[PDB]
UniProtKB/Swiss-Prot annotation, chain A:
One of its GO terms (biological process) is quinone metabolic process. This is Quinone oxidoreductase-like protein 1. The chain holds residues 2 to 112 of 349 of the full protein. The keyword Transmembrane helix does not apply. Homodimer. Component of the FERRY complex composed of five subunits, TBCK, PPP1R21, FERRY3, CRYZL1 and GATD1 with a ratio of 1:2:1:2:4, respectively. One of its GO terms (molecular function) is identical protein binding. It comes from Homo sapiens (Human). Its main location: other. Component of the FERRY complex (Five-subunit Endosomal Rab5 and RNA/ribosome intermediary). The FERRY complex directly interacts with mRNAs and RAB5A, and functions as a RAB5A effector involved in the localization and the distribution of specific mRNAs most likely by mediating their endosomal transport. The complex recruits mRNAs and ribosomes to early endosomes through direct mRNA-interaction. Belongs to the zinc-containing alcohol dehydrogenase family. Quinone oxidoreductase subfamily.
From Swiss-Prot, chain B:
Transmembrane segments: none annotated. The chain holds residues 259 to 519 of 780 of the full protein. Coiled-coil domains of PPP1R21 are essential for RNA binding. The lineage of its organism: Eukaryota, Metazoa, Chordata, Craniata, Vertebrata. This is Protein phosphatase 1 regulatory subunit 21. Component of the FERRY complex (Five-subunit Endosomal Rab5 and RNA/ribosome intermediary). The FERRY complex directly interacts with mRNAs and RAB5A, and functions as a RAB5A effector involved in the localization and the distribution of specific mRNAs most likely by mediating their endosomal transport. The complex recruits mRNAs and ribosomes to early endosomes through direct mRNA-interaction. In the complex, PPP1R21 serves as a binding hub connecting all five complex subunits and mediating the binding to mRNA and early endosomes via RAB5A.
Curated annotation (Swiss-Prot), chains C, D:
One of its GO terms (molecular function) is glyoxalase III activity. Homotetramer. Component of the FERRY complex composed of five subunits, TBCK, PPP1R21, FERRY3, CRYZL1 and GATD1 with a ratio of 1:2:1:2:4, respectively. One of its GO terms (cellular component) is extracellular exosome. Component of the FERRY complex (Five-subunit Endosomal Rab5 and RNA/ribosome intermediary). The FERRY complex directly interacts with mRNAs and RAB5A, and functions as a RAB5A effector involved in the localization and the distribution of specific mRNAs most likely by mediating their endosomal transport. The complex recruits mRNAs and ribosomes to early endosomes through direct mRNA-interaction. InterPro entries: Class_I_gatase-like, Prot/Nucl_acid_deglycase. It is found in: Secreted; Early endosome. Keywords: Endosome, Glycoprotein, Secreted, Signal. Belongs to the peptidase C56 family. Gene3D superfamilies: 3.40.50.880. Glycans are attached at residue 194. This is Glutamine amidotransferase-like class 1 domain-containing protein 1. The keyword Hydrolase does not apply. Residues 1-31 form the signal peptide.
Length: 115, 256, 210, 210
């Protein structure tokens, strides 16, 4: 049904081997209580500092892609204080983001955003 | 404080002693009322055990690697309701005591002095309850800085912290007032009515346990007096910087 | 047109006080559309008949309806207010009427004026929330009292519960006066302590809809 | 004949919430003969002037009956009621005014109706006997709890007096939820919790004197 397409980095041979097509996200809700859901309007691309991911050492096979985001706040978790829905914010996704920036909606910690 | 909070079990012991004290005056509406009153009195162990358990939880959250300016107060929030749980029962037992003592007056007490003085004792009991409720409404309001303090009057409750130190220190004497008043009340009740061995059986434990509680209240009073300045200084890191510390559900993000 | 108010009353073994029913009914009903109802529509028995309340008791029997309305067929929403006079029999019928609970959650959530007098205050026992918490936990009020109950008591489990209901919630409050007019009006909740307390309490409700 | 009512107030700095005075005075004054009184007759100070009330307080200054007479020359027997508007400066003046003790106990001795709302309620602390035993021990009434006092600024021992006063009073459980209206009537005394509680309270007094 409704799906949101997200590009994922693959960790192989310590660097320079990133590839894959964007993979679906199905029925993603806005769970957690400080993470807000955005209608992403723009995603900037940056060279991935892969070596930093490797020594940073998280164990994923797929890493989320896209971190420099601008968009409109769709909805917020209950503990959110600085942000309301329909608000227009911009921000950096964290390096250890759960969700890719190459996607039209995003769940992101609220203190990575600014109006 | 956790060690002194353990002393409340002595209050629980004397409350059970108070139950058997009432059972003793049954041979000596009151007949249904005493059993109903006793059944409500049995509930206290259930009511008060979370109070001490929650205070233990507060101690668990006050452990190091956590700033705990007001953060550890979230357990205090549970503790506040737990203290409310105690005092609800105390408020639950408050009118029940007043009538019961009147029915205890209905029991043969030829001497007017014992009858009048125990009415004064019940009034004193009402007073100790009243200061105790002042503490509970205070502490429940003190839990509001932990979560969503819309009022934001950081300066106000910095001063407010002193009030229980005064209330608690006076409460030590108020409990002593109960103790001394009860001492002759129990003694005279032991002296004239029969079943002296049962009278001694209830009176010795209630009198000693209330004296132990007065010791416990004195420990709380001395404790609060020494640590009162530390808590007021602890709450406010700096001028206008206390409110930033008390900002809701940012400190939790800050702990993360 | 004049506005509407619901008067709920006991048909149980304990019955209803005649003077409370008189005072609640007459002054309100000229300034309200008052409608009297009972669980199961059971006919009323008057307790505490005296020379003072007798003529109205026969006026009650002889006036056109005289058969109470169904309480379980009442949707509160057309009524501006809810009123319960002093009903010692509250425990079985009114304290267990889930329909009365549903009207209370309607009125509670709509913050509409509710007025309960004396023993009728025990009738609010049915109105817990979805959790065990009562809908008027946070509200400050009075109840009949232990002091009223112990005098001419007839104690059993049933006298125990009716005071017990206010007694359980510490956020709820109880004020004890033996035979005294006592009225509490706290934000659309009016509570009278006893049969004497009836006249200002419903006037306060009258003021609420004034 | 229509009855007279004594209004005692505090005429020391920031001495009267304006909206409370406006309601108490204007609605009471049509059904009572009011006489306003302060210690020493010092000029009145208004708290909580409002744009709706700015014209009306300028009219009150224009009004001839704006002077506050000395309180200790007052004979209570002419006044059928006593009415206290919400006045923040009572907490220094009136809570320590022995003459207010003399008139309240006078009101007590004939069981004559008393009305105190909000901050003025703390003036009832003053009615000490020779011993600590209060004249209004058995009465149930409301008052200002820690809630409104904490939410507003409360330094310089301004609400400390009131905090201590609550404790001495018994069977008088101050309501929580500061912003909510609260009126309590128990045997000739009506008491309002706050400035919001002003409107029904004297109406309840009005019902008292009806």
């Amino acid at each position: 049904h409704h799906h949101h397409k997200g590009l994922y980095f693959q960790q192989s041979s310590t660097d320079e081997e990133i590839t894959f097509v964007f993979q679906e996200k199905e029925d993603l809700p806005v769970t957690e209580d400080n993470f807000v859901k955005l209608q992403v309007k723009a995603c900037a691309l940056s060279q991935i500092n892969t070596k930093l991911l490797a020594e940073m050492k998280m164990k994923k096979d797929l890493f989320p892609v896209g971190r420099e985001i601008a968009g409109i706040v769709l909805d917020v978790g209950s503990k959110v204080s600085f942000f309301q829905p329909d608000d227009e914010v911009v921000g950096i996704l964290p390096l250890d983001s759960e969700d890719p920036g190459l996607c039209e909606v995003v769940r992101v910690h609220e203190h990575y955003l600014v109006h | 404080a956790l060690a002194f909070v353990q002393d409340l079990v002595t209050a629980l012991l004397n409350f059970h002693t108070y139950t058997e004290q009432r059972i003793q005056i049954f041979p000596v509406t009151i007949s249904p009322l005493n059993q109903k009153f006793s059944q409500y009195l049995h509930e206290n162990a259930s009511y008060v055990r979370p109070l001490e358990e929650g205070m233990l939880h507060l101690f668990e959250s006050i452990t190091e690697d956590t700033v705990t300016v007001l953060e550890t107060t979230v357990k205090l929030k549970t503790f506040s309701e737990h203290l409310t749980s105690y005092i609800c029962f105390l408020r639950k037992i408050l009118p029940y005591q007043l009538k019961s003592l009147e029915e205890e007056c209905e029991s043969s007490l030829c001497t007017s002095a014992l009858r009048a003085r125990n009415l004064e004792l019940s009034q004193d009991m009402k007073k100790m309850t009243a200061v105790f409720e002042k503490l509970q409404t205070y502490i429940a309001l003190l839990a509001l800085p932990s979560t969503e303090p819309d009022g934001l009057l950081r300066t106000n409750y910095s001063s407010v912290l002193t009030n229980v130190g005064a209330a608690l220190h006076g409460f030590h004497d108020v409990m002593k007032d109960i103790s001394k008043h009860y001492s002759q009340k129990a003694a005279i009740e032991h002296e004239l009515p029969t079943a002296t061995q049962k009278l001694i059986t209830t009176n010795d434990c209630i009198l000693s346990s209330v004296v132990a509680l007065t010791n416990g209240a004195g420990k709380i009073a001395s404790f609060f007096s020494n640590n009162l300045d530390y808590f007021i200084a602890s709450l406010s890191y700096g001028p206008k910087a206390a409110s930033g510390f008390i900002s809701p559900l940012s400190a939790e993000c800050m702990l993360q | 047109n004049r506005p509407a108010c619901l008067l709920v009353a006991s048909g149980a073994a304990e019955g209803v006080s005649a003077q409370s029913f008189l005072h609640c009914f007459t002054m309100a009903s000229t300034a309200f559309n008052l409608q009297v109802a009972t669980p199961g529509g059971k006919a009323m028995e008057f307790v505490d008949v005296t020379e003072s309340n007798a003529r109205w008791v026969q006026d009650f029997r002889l006036k056109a309806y005289a058969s109470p309305a169904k309480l379980e067929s009442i949707d509160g929403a057309r009524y501006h207010a809810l009123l319960i006079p002093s009903c010692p029999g509250a425990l079985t019928d009114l304290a267990s009427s889930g329909s009365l609970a549903r009207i209370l959650q309607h009125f509670h959530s709509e913050s509409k004026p509710i007025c309960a007098v004396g023993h009728g205050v025990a009738a609010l026992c049915c109105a817990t929330n979805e959790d065990r918490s009562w809908v008027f936990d946070s509200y400050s009020l009075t109840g009949p009292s232990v002091c009223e109950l112990v005098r001419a008591p007839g104690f059993a489990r049933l006298p125990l519960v009716v005071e017990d209901f206010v007694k359980d919630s510490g956020a709820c409050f109880s004020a004890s006066e033996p035979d005294a007019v006592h009225v509490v009006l706290d934000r659309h909740l009016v509570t009278g302590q006893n049969a004497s307390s009836t006249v200002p309490a419903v006037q306060n409700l009258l003021f609420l809809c004034g």
